[model samples]
Target chain A: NTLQLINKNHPLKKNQEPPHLVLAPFSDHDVYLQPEVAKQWERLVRATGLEKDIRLVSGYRTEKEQRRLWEYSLKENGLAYTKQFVALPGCSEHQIGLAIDVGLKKQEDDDLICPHFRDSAAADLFMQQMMNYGFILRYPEDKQEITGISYEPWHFRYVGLPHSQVITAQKWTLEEYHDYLAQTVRQ
Target chain B: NTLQLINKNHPLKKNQEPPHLVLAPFSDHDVYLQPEVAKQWERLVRATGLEKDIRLVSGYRTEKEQRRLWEYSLKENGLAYTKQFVALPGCSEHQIGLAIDVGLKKQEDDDLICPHFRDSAAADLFMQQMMNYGFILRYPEDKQEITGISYEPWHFRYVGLPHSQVITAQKWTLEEYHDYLAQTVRQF
Candidate 1:
């Protein structure tokens, strides 16, 4: 029920109950996720243990916050570069609360929120296992043209059981999977 | 007097007093700088004021720290890309304790540090005014070939007064300025 498509083409309207607010397990920020996705993520993190402590950098940003981030990226990187990376405010999965930005715990003091998490020591393990928790790499490298977003290896989105399995097995992006699902539904 | 060159070709020996330790004005990291350079940097920060408070992101790094950074960079960015930016362990000016990584105070919560600092509102003021404090942009975009490093708008190095003035005026990198100094010394 929480598996809603939000992107440049598809927008999410306000006042949703699926994204029930919950406190982040490891940080001060209040996390918003579909209840089941949050539980699965928590279970996954606990299974990974303290040694490979994967940290949540950003989760469930408000539309205003998303707009601010977009403007900040546009100002820093310019329009050409910004368009490739940042999603528009209402068009982001983050607002829907299914998307999360994850980072590895490099040091006790370091916040470690940069793009370098794609190559972190525990990244492979996390990547290999995340699909089991009903999540998929939202913007994959090869699917940039179809997704209308660059490769964001750190960005994970919950799509629920069989859908995530199908997406992973077929090597299809969320956009392609959405199309496939719509076509199947019509049939 | 603070213009001692420390690179792969010119190295600072152990047990040096020039890079005197000082507490960073805005952040938690302890800064190391030539005593006068530290004083000048404090003055520079004071002059800039609260509205555009510049914070130090990195200062003096030991050889071990540099190696860790180098390895981390190589792992994250790949060897081909790392070569263009990350300096080899002993080659970084941070080891000499004169170079600083500066960032602006964008928001109370934001700890912004990146190449995009070049476009910030406070960047031009810092660039225009830093020479007066005997500091120069360590890696300018035009001198990437000469410096063997890419443009890093956040990096600044203290070279002391007249040398900084001449280098900025002629648009020469530290390498070019070193050669020019050697040539002048030979003629004299």
Candidate 2:
């Protein structure tokens, strides 16, 4: 549903230096959720009656970080730059703060990987309840083909509750939902 | 993160006719999930322990349906052209087969209300499982401002799990994700 295109006012030609990434004044570099999303997450956690604290491992990535990751992905095949790993340039979603990476904050470090998170009860609770808070898994195993990425357990995107409610209710992937909106946009 | 732009390959300049509407397939549209998203949905239902029948509602809108939708949107918006909905004819994701809509098949007076199905436990199950299948919800609410519209729940677009997982794990809106991809395209 989302493919990066040059903005007409993009300032630079394709492959040129991009305009300075403009982060919202309210944005913080640390892993954090939008205030409303945070509030909703709190509500969801309470509703699910989960005992562990939901931890945010990563949040908004600056353009610099995005570029660094892309370079790492391109150079380090075993390290990160696999098609199944990081997206090439013009393919990352971190420019928007709406996305987030979350995991159950353990008091002690654990080697638990994403698959384990998907298999956990916490993930289940999140899938069932996070929608009410305007957040979603963003990418799921089913729509991998359209999303162009692998399944990620800790990743979540905030589309807002109105959107989340519809998405959550309908089980539509973010891509499918966006395409539908194309119809709405045309209308 | 997304914005309107000039069509790079307009047909008129190329001695071709540029129809108002176009369709393009999502990258994963033609490819079925190797592990299979449907299977993951089934697993999610079992894991959630939700007492509901999760079902696949719609997948891969056909070109015909795409045409109808594009036409409907053009008319509703009073656009003089058909290209407004899909950018150009034959460049739509619906033409591809990967995208799908999932639900428990909502019932209304003993029949199905496609819109209502999202509220079911099966929908909940689908929600949990779809991510594992490499599906994503497009036009997520947070990106609405950038997406140029409100959200629609009954849709799922496919991207391979690798990209999907990273995007999902990062928690950025598709708009934000799209930006990163654009940047990546430059370096590669």
Candidate 3:
């Protein structure tokens, strides 16, 4: 269940409101993430002082919300940029409530679609500490081709423990991990 | 919210059903614990092989269920024993969904009311590792007089981290922790 994979090719087959969703803390607005993931987020926040360092820009977007983002990006940013960054509706991890987009706290003007996340001690600590707390950079700069998206240092995915650690350690994208798991099953 | 102190002296004044309860895993019958607590229970089960070591004898109970337990214990275990063991309906921690009753797996004939939970390597490991997973042995032996309850090694209460770790380190009961917090507030 933790290894839930979504991308352009492997669209969500069966969808329902994510069960056991809890109101994520620290955010001013109403936002939700699955309980276990949110608990780890709390732990990460404590360890990294994430409240002072980062702002949770997006979490657990609905299907309609994802659709709006997809269409909006296509029209506003053009097809090439949208294709590079925006996940197609029904194929977004945000809809599954496991992915989150974070923005740096001190960014004078932050982009909602692509938050200014890198280039600070806090950001560096966040990237390093997130893996320890069951999170991985969902779209790494080096694995853009395999992930079918451009580098997104702000986006993080919860794969849960051991898996997140393994994925981070192996330097493999979620897609690559899926292939590795498939081969493991076959052999 | 995790520091909810419910006992004979401190009865429930404003009681509500615990929000965000999920069915506890590794349980045959329906049992529930708060989501964060249950998640930690899962981690403990995985780390300590708790499935093979123990059984989840009891978890979140309704007011009616707690009343039933209170009456049943009084009838079967006698007045003094029931007073020592069974929490009164409104004062039971089980109603808050943060406490659990675990019994030894190989006890062959286990007692649901008071599970036999000690005397093995696995049980020892469970006792040691539970603190690391944000659990504290409720109604510990030395603190029996202060707790106003009999020692219940099988009962584990989730107060969440830092608090659990601090309580374990300070060698204090939940009541003692409450006093400490109160004193800290007064001093501040």
* Residue pairs with backbone overlap in model 3: none
True contacts kept of each: 0.00, 0.00, 0.00
Candidate 3 wrongly placed segments (more than 4 Å): A1-187
Interface RMSD of each: 16.2, 20.5, 21.2
Return the candidate ranking by lDDT, descending: 3, 1, 2
Q: Please, what are the lDDT tens digits per residue for candidate 3 over residues A17-118?
A: 454565565442234677788788889988887776666666776555576567656766899998898899888998788987777654533455777888
Give every candidate's TM-score on chain A.
Answer: 0.87, 0.69, 0.94
Candidate 1 local lDDT, A20-103, one digit each (tens): 544345422223455576677887777766334566656665565566566655665788787887788799887766877776
Each candidate's DockQ score against the native complex? Answer: 0.02, 0.01, 0.01
Going through the candidates in order, what is chain B's TM-score?
Answer: 0.85, 0.56, 0.94
On lDDT, the candidate that comes out on top is 3
Which portions of model 2 show Cα errors greater than 4 Å? A1-29, A51-53, A73-81, A107-116, A184-187, B1-188
Residue A134 of candidate 3: its Cα lDDT? 92
Ranking by TM-score: 3, 1, 2
Q: What is the lDDT of residue B164 in candidate 1?
A: 81
lDDT tens digits by residue: candidate 1, B109-150 = 321223345566687888888888788888899777777788
